[PDB]
């Protein structure tokens, strides 16, 4: 898949990559983390278990439009009704912007979900309200 790749853990580490890189890595139970690598409605395309947590991976985007925001906020809210957290790991401060710009957060408890590296989304998830 061109447009999202799933990440895993090399063990005993904070280092996050392609699962298909190298053989040791391994992704966590109960975490999906995928790394955007096209526009997330290209992504959604491929979206269309015991799973508790989704990280996306945000290290690669540089910018966000409007529709990207609202395919997000779905994706966000969908996993949500059915109590999975959607993380958004790496985030620039512009990227920020575009999601705050087309009110994302207009739910202020939406920046909750940020995190700045992926570890730390992982870390997030360790414990947190149900």
Not at 21 to 46: H, L, M, R
Request: glycine share 6%; aromatic share 12%; proline share 4%.
């Amino acid at each position: 898949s061109p447009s999202y790749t799933v990440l895993g853990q090399l063990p005993d580490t904070d280092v996050y990559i392609d699962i298909d890189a190298y053989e040791e890595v391994k992704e966590i139970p109960g975490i999906k983390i995928f790394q955007i690598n096209a526009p997330i409605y290209y992504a959604n395309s491929d979206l269309y278990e015991n799973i508790h947590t989704v990280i996306l991976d945000f290290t690669q985007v540089n910018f966000m439009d409007s529709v990207g925001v609202k395919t997000l906020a779905g994706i966000v809210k969908e996993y949500g009704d059915v109590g999975i957290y959607v993380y958004l790991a790496g985030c620039s401060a512009q990227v920020v912007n575009d999601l705050t710009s087309n009110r994302f957060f207009e739910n202020p408890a939406l920046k909750e979900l940020l995190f700045h590296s992926i570890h730390d989304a992982v870390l997030g998830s360790q414990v947190r309200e149900a």
